[PDB]
Design a protein around this ligand. Structure first.
Ligand SMILES: CCCCCCCCCCCCCCCCCC(=O)OC[C@H](COP(=O)(O)OCCN)OC(=O)CCCCCCCCCCCCCCCCC
Ligand SMILES: CCCCCCCCCCCCCCCCCC(=O)OC[C@H](COP(=O)(O)OCCN)OC(=O)CCCCCCCCCCCCCCCCC
Ligand SMILES: CCCCCCCCCCCCCCCCCC(=O)OC[C@H](COP(=O)(O)OCCN)OC(=O)CCCCCCCCCCCCCCCCC
Ligand SMILES: C/C=C(/C)[C@H](O)[C@H](C)/C=C(C)\C=C/C/C(C)=C\Cc1[nH]c(OC)c(OC)c(=O)c1C
Ligand code: SF4
Lengths: 198, 100, 102, 311, 60, 150
């Protein structure tokens, strides 16, 4: 099952064009350039993930450009304030295709604990979001897990290869949700370690 | 194999084209550009003349020519900066107050 | 000689293939993918210093390749040249022309 | 005819040198990532391929299939023109380097002079990128960077003039043949350090590093690969000018050239990873007040020593 | 500037270069997620569950 | 007393975490890159201890009205001893590698300086007030939570 934005359609993918599309998606998922955007706590956990004790560089995502033109992925790592919501919208509009959005934290997901007059309740109110991460803050390894989720989503999509030949239509993959996928093993947990130990 | 007349013809053509660029343009920047075209064309003429005779005299006068060109560029661009600072425009007939 | 014309051909092919590869990968970058104040005079000052001292540098370029045949008199002339150049440089430094901050 | 065979062999050697140095620059960027990881107690990119060696191909594919974006109210020709300047100037600066006896592109009688022409033409990339972006922030940043690289370019040839004076010629074969007994790093040590500083600064490397916040896709790739091509160029130049070139006692000469060049590239990596960044005016003062008189005094002392031995 | 502080600065740059070069030979501090499983303390606050009593019903 | 000692322990641990982040970010603002990676490794050691104590890294939410949430786990002293053995050599290494560099000194010394009067009239407290020589720490002038015992 696939989603069009230019709807619900089927997989359209000839075998040579599919192979080149596979290599294009492979090169796109194996090189993701996030935008250096410092909002709040979750950005500090992102730069914790970037450092040597964690080494997100192994996935080829250590670039962290300061310009929206060079960067591909927008990580909303913090609260969407009413003053910074046009700033986030302009920074998203100043990006280039392909563009992916990862919302770090309950602030970026839904507004989090701050149901307040000066906070936008989630960045998905006005920009599309590819991957959400819960946590306040999510740990750096959760950020890497969402990075592999984004890589899996990129490796299955079918973007147009060229702007002169082909269907100019964004083909995102309706992946199986992680809750239903991991319900087979999360329920089977019986005994955990007692909290008195370390 | 290359005639000397061809080299001086090319140098003369570049020089007189630089003369057009100096005359027909009111902008002082293009006037300095045309001046540099003329002095570089005359330096090309000296190099052609020295290369015909097999002597380094043309290259020595070329070195003197480009030294003059560099220093003239410095002075002319400083004067252009002063004109733009104190008049906010580069019109060369705006600086025409002294006459008669 | 065959060696000199062969190396001229090699240099020409080097330049042509470099330019062709660079513009070709420009063409490949453009072809693929789907669509969606007043400055200060200090810049002029340091640039004009650079130009003047590059002409002094070209004179020293001409000198340095032929020190052996010019003899000691060439060393004396270049010493006067370099002393004048250093006097000009000290003049520029001391009056705060080369100091970027005021 | 044997003449055409020799011509074709020379052309093949030249194009082999060209693809080798371009691939070496790209893999040197990959080695930048890996060696920064090694210096910073981590791994760097080591998942895309065997040991991470296929990260470069994926990155180049990503920059190839990125949507190109020339700004709407920019100057198209100048904006696209700055990256071919930044690539081709340093590539043709590498073009004069003799990597091995017989494996030379062109035995130009100017040589290091031709490197000086290419280094002079290299500043137009920064200036054109600043102006053509139609951004006053990029304009100010490129004005500062171009003033930096002019103030450090003004003594580049004067640093090289000690090696030129000791060789007695502008040809690089004579330069690498005059280092048979002793390498030029020993007499021209002050020239060596001034040339190293100037070569780092004209390549806009750390700690001499915005005017790139408007480029994206393959133009940014052009700028960056041209910068690494310049790194390889400066390393090979200092190998050929101060460390004997290809000359070595035991190993084949190309192995010596590659080992010295790789040592100088890893010195580039260490210089970026170690030193912090000085302020703009401090860099200006160091480039004007210190380096230029040092090169002048070095040239004077070199000439005095050369004329002293030849009584 | 004064030659003394210039030489001291050059020596300090050499010291920083040598210290990073010594760091090049050290052992990696990278915890290799996801190949290396991330150790978490027993009382770490993550995914929320509802448990069961030893009889077998739901505790809530 | 045990509540006071526990809260002092966690406050000092988070103070070391914040100071490590501050020093690394200042050094990165000057231009050196490696100390931010090394200081975040040290912050990961701190986060290991804090995860063992409370159950979270950044916002433990562990203090309570009248005490703390849970008790100290069985074996926290091993992690604290490991951290106290890990820190000082690395801190001296950070000083030698970046904080004694003369380029960093030229960038940072004498920049945005103010005396005690400017700190007092603007309400600046902390290191900005104690760099003026005004010895005013809340932990010593108006003590709280058992800081007198240390
Ligand atoms: C752009 C297209 C270029 C196509 C190729 C142009 C010719 C390249 C070769 C060349 O310039 O050869 C002339 C000269 C040879 O120098 P050399 O071998 O030392 O002298 C022979 C004996 N007098 O070599 C030179 O004069 C080299 C200096 C000029 C190089 C210009 C490079 C582009 C700018
Ligand atoms: C005569 C020697 C040069 C001279 O006058 O040196 C003293 C001069 C004073 O320095 P100042 O202009 O205050 O600023 C330099 C910042 N350290 O310092 C300078 O002019 C800076 C150093 C210039 C050295 C030029 C070459 C001197 C001879 C070798
Ligand atoms: C292909 C191979 C090439 C690879 C690279 C190898 C060479 C790297 C060269 C890097 C050059 C960096 C130059 C930096 C110059 C900085 C000058 C400056 O002004 O620095 C500021 C600092 C303080 O300035 P000051 O005015 O005194 O401040 C008072 C106000 N607070 O002033 C100071 O701290 C004074 C000291 C400045 C630096 C002195 C020179 C250091 C050179 C770099 C270290 C080289 C180590 C050996 C490298 C390998 C050699 C084989
Ligand atoms: C082959 C072409 C390319 C573009 C390559 O893909 C790579 C990306 C090139 C290079 C030169 C590698 C590394 C430099 C870099 C872009 C970032 C390091 C970094 N990393 C951080 O986090 C870990 C930071 O902390 C916030 C930083 O400040 C800094 C500065
Ligand atoms: S979700 Fe929590 S940790 Fe993240 S920015 Fe919001 S308050 Fe901070």
């Amino acid at each position: 099952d696939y989603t069009l934005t230019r709807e619900i359609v089927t997989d359209p993918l000839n075998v040579f064009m599919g192979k080149l599309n596979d290599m294009v998606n492979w090169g796109r998922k194996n090189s993701i350039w996030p935008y250096n955007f410092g909002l709040s706590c979750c950005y500090v956990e992102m730069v914790t993930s970037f450092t040597a004790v964690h080494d997100v560089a192994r996935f080829g995502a250590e670039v962290l450009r300061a310009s929206p033109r060079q960067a591909d992925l927008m990580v909303v790592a913090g609260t969407c304030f009413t003053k910074m919501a046009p700033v986030i919208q302009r920074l998203y509009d100043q990006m280039l295709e392909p563009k992916w959005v990862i919302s770090m934290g309950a602030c970026a997901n839904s507004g989090g604990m701050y149901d307040i007059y000066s906070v936008v309740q989630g960045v998905d109110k006005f920009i599309p979001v590819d991957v959400y991460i819960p946590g306040c803050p999510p740990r750096p390894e959760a950020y890497m897990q969402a990075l592999m989720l984004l890589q899996e989503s990129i490796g299955k999509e079918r973007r147009p290869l060229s702007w002169v030949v082909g269907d100019q239509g964004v083909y995102r993959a309706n992946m199986q949700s992680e809750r239903e996928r991991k319900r087979g093993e999360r329920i089977a947990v019986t005994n955990l370690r007692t909290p008195d130990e370390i | 194999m290359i005639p000397l007349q061809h080299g001086l013809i090319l140098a003369a053509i570049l020089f007189v084209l630089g003369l057009t660029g100096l005359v027909i343009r009111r902008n002082l920047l293009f006037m300095l550009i045309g001046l540099e075209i003329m002095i570089n064309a005359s330096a090309l003429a000296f190099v052609v003349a020295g290369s015909y005779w097999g002597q380094t005299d043309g290259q020595v006068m070329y070195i003197l020519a480009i030294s003059l060109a560099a220093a003239e560029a410095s002075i002319g661009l400083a004067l252009l900066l002063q004109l733009h600072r104190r008049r906010q425009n580069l019109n060369i007939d705006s600086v025409s107050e002294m006459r008669g | 000689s065959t060696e000199v014309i062969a190396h001229h051909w090699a240099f020409a092919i080097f330049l042509i293939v470099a330019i062709g590869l660079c513009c070709l990968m420009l063409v490949g970058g453009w072809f693929l993918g789907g669509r969606a104040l007043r400055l200060s005079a200090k810049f002029y000052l340091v640039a004009m210093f650079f130009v003047i001292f590059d002409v002094e540098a070209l004179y020293l370029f001409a000198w340095s390749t032929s020190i052996r045949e010019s003899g000691w008199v060439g060393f004396v002339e270049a010493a006067i040249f370099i002393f004048v150049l250093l006097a000009g440089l000290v003049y520029l430094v001391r009056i705060g022309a080369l100091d970027w901050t005021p | 005819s044997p003449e055409l065979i020799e011509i074709l062999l020379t052309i093949l050697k030249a194009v082999v040198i060209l693809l080798v140095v371009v691939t070496c620059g790209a893999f040197m960027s990959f080695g930048e990532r890996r060696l920064l990881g090694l210096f910073q107690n981590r791994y760097g990119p080591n998942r895309v391929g065997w040991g991470g060696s296929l990260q470069l191909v994926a990155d180049m594919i990503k920059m190839f299939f990125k949507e190109d974006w020339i700004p709407k109210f920019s100057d198209r020709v100048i904006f696209t023109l700055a990256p071919m300047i930044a690539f081709t100037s340093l590539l043709l600066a590498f073009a004069i380097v003799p990597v091995s006896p017989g494996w030379v592109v062109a035995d130009l009688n100017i040589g290091i002079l031709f490197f000086l022409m290419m280094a002079g033409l290299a500043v137009y990339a920064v200036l054109f990128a600043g102006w053509s972006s139609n951004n006053k922030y990029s304009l100010l940043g490129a004005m500062r960077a171009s003033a930096q690289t002019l103030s450090y370019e003004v003594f580049l040839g004067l640093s090289l003039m000690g090696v030129v004076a000791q060789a007695g010629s502008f040809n690089m074969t004579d330069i690498v043949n005059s280092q048979a007994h002793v390498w030029n790093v020993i007499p021209q040590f002050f020239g060596f350090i001034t040339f190293a500083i100037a070569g780092v600064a004209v390549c806009h490397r750390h700690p001499f590093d915005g005017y790139h916040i408007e480029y994206s896709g393959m133009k940014f790739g052009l700028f960056f690969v041209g910068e690494y091509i310049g790194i390889v160029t400066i390393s090979a130049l200092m190998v050929t000018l101060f460390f004997g070139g290809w000359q070595g006692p035991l190993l084949p000469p190309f192995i010596w050239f590659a080992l010295k060049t790789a040592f100088f590239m890893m010195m580039f990596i260490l210089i970026r990873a170690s030193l912090p960044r000085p302020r703009y005016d401090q860099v200006m003062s160091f480039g004007w007040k210190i380096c230029l008189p040092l090169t002048l005094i070095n040239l004077l002392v070199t000439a005095a020593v050369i004329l002293w031995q030849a009584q | 500037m004064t030659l003394k502080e210039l030489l001291v600065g050059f020596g300090t740059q050499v010291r920083s270069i040598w210290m990073i070069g010594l760091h090049a030979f050290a052992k990696r501090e990278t915890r290799m997620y996801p190949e290396e499983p991330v150790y978490l303390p027993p009382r770490y606050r993550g995914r929320i569950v509802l448990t069961r009593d030893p009889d077998g019903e739901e505790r809530c | 007393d045990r509540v006071n000692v526990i809260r002092v322990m966690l406050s000092e641990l988070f103070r070391i975490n914040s100071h490590l982040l501050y020093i690394s970010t200042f050094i990165q603002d000057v231009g050196a890159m490696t100390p931010v990676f090394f200081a975040f490794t040290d912050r990961q050691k701190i986060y290991d201890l804090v995860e063992a104590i409370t159950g979270f890294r950044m916002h433990p939410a562990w203090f309570r009205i009248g005490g703390v949430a849970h008790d100290l786990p069985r074996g926290w002293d091993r992690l604290l001893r490991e951290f106290l053995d890990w820190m000082p050599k690395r801190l001296a290494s950070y000083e030698k590698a970046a904080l004694q560099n003369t380029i960093l000194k030229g960038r940072s010394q004498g920049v945005a300086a103010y005396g005690a009067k400017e700190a007092l009239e603007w309400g600046t407290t902390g290191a900005g007030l104690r760099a003026t020589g005004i010895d005013f720490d809340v932990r010593k002038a108006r003590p709280y939570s058992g800081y007198e015992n240390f």
